[PDB]
From Swiss-Prot, chain A:
The lineage of its organism: Eukaryota, Fungi, Dikarya, Ascomycota, Saccharomycotina. It comes from the Eukaryota. Component the THO subcomplex of the TREX complex, which operates in coupling transcription elongation to mRNA export. The THO complex is recruited to transcribed genes and moves along the gene with the elongating polymerase during transcription. THO is important for stabilizing nascent RNA in the RNA polymerase II elongation complex by preventing formation of DNA:RNA hybrids behind the elongating polymerase. Component of the THO complex, which is composed of HPR1, MFT1, THO2 and THP2. Together with SUB2, TEX1 and YRA1, THO forms the transcription/export (TREX) complex. THO associates with DNA and RNA in vitro. Belongs to the THOC2 family. The gene is THO2. It is found in: Nucleus. Signal peptide: none annotated. Present with 521 molecules/cell in log phase SD medium. This is THO complex subunit 2.
From Swiss-Prot, chain B:
It is found in: Nucleus. It comes from Saccharomyces cerevisiae (strain ATCC 204508 / S288c). HPR1 is not required for sporulation, and is not essential for DNA repair. It is probably not a DNA topoisomerase. Present with 1340 molecules/cell in log phase SD medium. GO terms for cellular component: Cdc73/Paf1 complex; chromosome, telomeric region; nucleoplasmic THO complex; THO complex; THO complex part of transcription export complex; transcription export complex. This is THO complex subunit HPR1. Component the THO subcomplex of the TREX complex, which operates in coupling transcription elongation to mRNA export. The THO complex is recruited to transcribed genes and moves along the gene with the elongating polymerase during transcription. THO is important for stabilizing nascent RNA in the RNA polymerase II elongation complex by preventing formation of DNA:RNA hybrids behind the elongating polymerase. GO terms for biological process: DNA recombination; mRNA 3'-end processing; mRNA export from nucleus; positive regulation of transcription by RNA polymerase I; positive regulation of transcription elongation by RNA polymerase I; transcription elongation by RNA polymerase II; transcription-coupled nucleotide-excision repair. The chain holds residues 52 to 502 of 752 of the full protein.
From Swiss-Prot, chain C:
GO terms for biological process: cellular response to azide; DNA recombination; mRNA export from nucleus; stress granule assembly; transcription elongation by RNA polymerase II. One of its GO terms (molecular function) is nucleic acid binding. GO terms for cellular component: nucleoplasmic THO complex; THO complex; THO complex part of transcription export complex; transcription export complex. This is THO complex subunit THP2. Keywords: Nucleus, Transcription, Transcription regulation. Component of the THO complex, which is composed of HPR1, MFT1, THO2 and THP2. Together with SUB2, TEX1 and YRA1, THO forms the transcription/export (TREX) complex. THO associates with DNA and RNA in vitro. The gene is THP2.
Swiss-Prot record, chain D:
It is found in: Nucleus. It comes from Saccharomyces cerevisiae (strain ATCC 204508 / S288c). Component the THO subcomplex of the TREX complex, which operates in coupling transcription elongation to mRNA export. The THO complex is recruited to transcribed genes and moves along the gene with the elongating polymerase during transcription. THO is important for stabilizing nascent RNA in the RNA polymerase II elongation complex by preventing formation of DNA:RNA hybrids behind the elongating polymerase. Present with 5910 molecules/cell in log phase SD medium. Component of the THO complex, which is composed of HPR1, MFT1, THO2 and THP2. Together with SUB2, TEX1 and YRA1, THO forms the transcription/export (TREX) complex. THO associates with DNA and RNA in vitro. This is THO complex subunit MFT1. Disulfide bonds: none annotated. It comes from the Eukaryota. The gene is MFT1.
Length: 160, 451, 180, 138
């Protein structure tokens, strides 16, 4: 009890622990892709996402996962809103945004928390709803390596 | 140099010199105007902190610089006299986030790893103190502004990326389901009367609260319960979902009878081939695509509505997706009229998250043995019982779980809109990948290798 | 009696200064015991002052600990009061219960505006118009209608324009084709 | 190996009243180090043993005099830091209760937009009933 109520951060990983908090974050990204004005309103949604992520004490390592799992179902039509929303965020690498177009800059990269989530999500292929959505998730990941969001050898070394 | 009697550990003295220099410079704000005396006090502290990091090779030890640097940074967060002056300082913290992780090491860590443990010296007394600041903003649940929550998000996101992802105080180890989740306003609640229940929409709204207060708040109380406690939900939940899912039958038929009776009048007008295509989004109709006068009508409305919701007079407002529970006049008006279709898509996302746990709790056996050690380690003389199979109980949970989602939710959305149905099936599939990861102890996130 | 956290914390600094003075008065006596060129009379005089200060230091370091405990119980007493008890002092409920109600009616109709731009979005019946025989292919995504039909539809969404007057202007355009 | 109801609420209380405080616990190390030192010189024991702090020095006893003055200022500045942090939270709790108190001059700004945004739906639902009737004939 000394390390549960005095050292443990009060944040909620799973989608069942705070079902009101993740029920609003999901229904916001459904709205953000059914809106014809999504380039004047990048910070009109990015100031809303940071207001549900702090009212309800949601985790940042899971909110990055829920963002990358609703975005990959709308990646055909809206794929330039998904990068424009994610370039202004506080999860975009600001100082270590190093690119995958050099031969020595394939090691030095940025955002090793999203290098843990995609390498965990591409290494699972043992279900029958996970198989019908692996192609569209692999396209969404391949846009992120181009813009410099993640490294190459962070994803290459940690897939099955 | 004029004094010669620094016979002590001089690095203990220089910390006190650096501590008093921050305290008076943060309080002295009477020399000029208050807004521009702030950045004269804030700046003298920021050069004081960078003075510690650069002059870290010249002190007595390499390891001692980490405890001075966490001491001075924790002092500044007390003297910041507002949430508004905390947000304008906080870009100093998010930029030098690689300075915190290199604890007791003069050469920096590479990227990704951190030399920080939750029960060791720099975080032994600071993590207990920074959780007290976060408990203050959380307990104050009726006088919180939008600058308060932004203070709360940027502070817990500072600590989540400070500690490793496989760290015992970092992944919600004992899985605590939240009970303070109340998307509700205090000032619209009118006495919660249960006496004059003449209209049917009251106990509609009241048992909507009860299916919220007893399923979604607590799924571990629902599964390990009696056979009559599951009987008053099902006789009330089935009038609820068959009044909601008959509205989206009438909302999606508005879209279908719009375009098909245009295409049948296009098959009547133009006869070229069998014009039978898939129903997709009517993107921007014919004329709103290239209309710079129609565009500036809308693009100036999203500039007025953003300036209202940003100034320091409107900082007391609910979220945009907030579904009000106490106000029974606003709750019935959000779910019934067929033009929002987001306040009743919040209920289906809320329902399919707990119902997914009702299946995995009753059926599996390592899941029930995990929640043994979660309740019995914190409350050893507990109240509810779980101890064995309960074969008379297993037949009722799985027959209400598989009916309410697999037989009414997931077979309705596969016909109406097959893009939203692909989000529910992926979100429920991703939850069991992480629940199984928590039971193990998040130790597949430990083998992540850095080149 | 009931004390506040602010008053109990400021009283701790008063008892802290009393412990400092007896601490410094003892420490200089130990210094003059350790002088190398020390005199015979000062080592006899200083030791007589010693037991009177020793039991005085204990009575000050005990009250320091006793006021470290009384501020800890006053700290926790003010945290249980926070929340909905501080805002139970306002005397204007009708002004706030209509301010939150006119904001909850605002976001409900902002979603209805977005749900009328892309997701319902009624369009024209695209009737093909072909004049040049040198293109030989047509795409039904860049069909732009007639300017007499566009300028009527342009000014309808434009402001300060009646709902019943332009209905005849539609009927002006509708019956114009019905003659021809 | 069972527990009791009394035995659970005795550990539910020790956690709730547990504090770690590095400036305060370091000052009482100095107050403790001198009372055991002036205790033995009253009795008569003074030897070359390392169980106590030190025997007799000019420099290192004055080093204890420096330690008694350094940790006093660290404790004094920390009580002042807890003083100003409590004063600031009471001010923002009062000015938020002042901003919640009036709420009358900011009400006409919302009802302008909500009567303007309800006007913009009146045109589009009339525009989508204008284009819907010209397509129904042909």
């Amino acid at each position: 009890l000394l390390k549960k109520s005095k050292y443990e951060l009060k944040k909620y990983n799973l989608l069942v622990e705070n079902s009101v908090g993740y029920g609003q974050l999901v229904a916001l990204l459904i709205l953000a892709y059914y809106d014809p004005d999504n380039f004047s309103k990048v910070s009109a949604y990015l100031k809303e996402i940071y207001h549900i992520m702090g009212k309800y004490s949601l985790d940042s390592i899971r909110t990055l996962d829920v963002i990358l799992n609703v975005s990959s179902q709308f990646i055909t039509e809206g794929y330039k809103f998904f990068i424009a929303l994610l370039r202004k965020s506080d999860s975009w690498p600001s100082s270590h945004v190093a690119n995958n177009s050099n031969y020595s800059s394939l090691n030095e990269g940025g955002n090793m928390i999203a290098a843990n989530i995609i390498s965990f999500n591409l290494s699972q292929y043992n279900e029958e709803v996970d198989k019908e959505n692996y192609e569209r998730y692999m396209d969404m990941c391949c846009i992120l390596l181009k813009n410099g969001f993640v490294n190459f050898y962070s994803i290459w070394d940690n897939v099955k | 140099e004029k004094n010669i009697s620094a016979i002590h550990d001089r690095d203990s003295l220089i910390d006190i010199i650096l501590k008093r220099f921050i305290i008076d410079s943060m309080t002295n704000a009477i020399e000029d105007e208050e807004e521009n005396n702030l950045e004269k006090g804030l700046l003298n502290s920021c050069i004081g902190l960078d003075f510690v990091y650069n002059s870290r090779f010249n002190r007595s030890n390499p390891a001692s610089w980490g405890n001075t640097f966490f001491e001075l940074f924790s002092t500044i967060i007390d003297l910041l006299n507002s949430p508004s002056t905390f947000l304008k300082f906080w870009p100093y913290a998010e930029s030098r986030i690689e300075w915190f992780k290199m604890n007791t090491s003069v050469e920096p860590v590479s990227l990704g790893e951190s030399n920080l443990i939750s029960y060791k010296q720099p975080l032994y007394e600071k993590l207990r103190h920074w959780n007290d600041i976060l408990a203050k903003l959380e307990n104050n649940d009726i006088l919180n502004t939008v600058k308060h929550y932004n203070m709360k998000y940027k502070l817990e996101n500072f600590l989540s990326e400070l500690l490793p992802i496989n760290e015992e105080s970092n992944f919600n180890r004992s899985a605590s389901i939240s009970a303070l989740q109340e998307s509700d306003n205090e000032w619209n609640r009118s006495a919660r009367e249960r006496e004059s229940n003449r209209s049917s929409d009251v106990i509609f709204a009241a048992d909507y609260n009860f299916v919220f207060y007893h399923l979604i708040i607590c799924p571990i109380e629902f599964a390990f319960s009696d056979l009559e406690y599951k009987n008053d939900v099902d006789r009330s939940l089935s009038p609820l979902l068959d009044a909601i899912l008959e509205i989206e039958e009438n909302f999606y038929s508005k879209i279908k009878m719009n375009n098909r009776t245009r295409y049948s009048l296009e098959e009547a007008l133009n006869t070229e081939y069998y014009a039978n295509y898939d129903v997709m989004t009517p993107k921007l109709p014919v004329y709103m695509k290239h209309s710079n006068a129609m565009k500036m009508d809308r693009n100036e409305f999203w500039a007025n509505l953003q300036n209202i919701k940003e100034s320091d007079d409107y900082t007391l407002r609910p979220t945009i997706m907030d579904i009000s529970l106490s106000n029974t006049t606003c709750l019935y008006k959000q779910l019934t009229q067929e033009d929002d279709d987001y306040y009743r898509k919040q209920f289906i996302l809320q329902l399919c998250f707990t119902t997914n746990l009702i299946r995995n709790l009753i059926s599996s056996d390592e899941t029930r043995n995990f929640y043994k050690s979660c309740y019995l380690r914190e409350n050893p003389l507990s109240d509810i019982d779980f101890e064995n199979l309960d074969e008379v109980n297993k037949k009722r949970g799985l027959n209400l779980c598989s009916y309410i989602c697999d037989n009414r939710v997931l077979k309705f959305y596969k016909i109406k809109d097959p893009d939203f149905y692909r989000v529910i099936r992926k979100l429920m599939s991703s939850d069991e990948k992480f629940t199984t990861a928590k039971i193990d102890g998040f130790k597949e996130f430990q083998n992540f290798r850095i080149s | 009696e009931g004390r506040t956290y602010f008053e109990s914390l400021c009283e701790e600094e008063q008892s802290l200064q009393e412990s400092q003075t007896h601490l410094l008065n003892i420490l200089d006596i130990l210094s003059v015991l350790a002088d190398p060129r020390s005199s015979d009379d000062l080592l006899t005089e200083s030791l007589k002052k010693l037991p009177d200060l020793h039991r005085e230091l204990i009575n000050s370091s005990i009250r320091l600990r006793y006021d470290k405990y009384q501020t800890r119980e006053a700290q926790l007493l003010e945290d249980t009061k926070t929340g909905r008890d501080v805002a139970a002092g306002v005397q204007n409920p009708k002004s706030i219960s209509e301010y939150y109600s006119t904001f909850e009616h605002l976001n409900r109709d902002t979603l209805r505006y977005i749900n009328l731009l892309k997701r319902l979005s009624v369009d024209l019946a695209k009737q093909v118009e072909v004049s040049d025989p040198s293109v030989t292919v047509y795409e039904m995504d860049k069909w732009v209608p007639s300017e007499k039909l566009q300028g009527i539809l342009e000014q309808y969404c434009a402001p300060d324009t009646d709902i019943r007057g332009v209905d005849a202007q539609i009927k002006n355009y509708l019956d114009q084709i019905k003659m021809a | 190996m069972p527990l009791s109801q009394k035995q659970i609420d005795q550990v539910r209380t020790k956690v709730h009243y547990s504090e770690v405080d590095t400036p305060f616990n370091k000052y009482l190390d100095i107050l403790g180090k001198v009372t055991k030192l002036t205790g033995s010189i009253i009795n008569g024991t003074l030897s070359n043993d390392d169980s106590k702090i030190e025997k007799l020095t000019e420099q290192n006893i004055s080093q204890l005099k420096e330690s008694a003055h350094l940790r006093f200022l660290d404790l004094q500045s920390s009580i002042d830091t807890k003083k100003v942090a409590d004063e600031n939270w009471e001010t923002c709790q009062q000015e938020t209760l002042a901003k919640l108190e009036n709420l009358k001059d900011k009400l006409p700004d919302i009802k302008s937009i909500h009567s303007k945004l309800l006007l913009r739906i009146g045109k589009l639902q009339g525009l989508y009933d204008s284009v819907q009737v010209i397509n129904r004939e042909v």
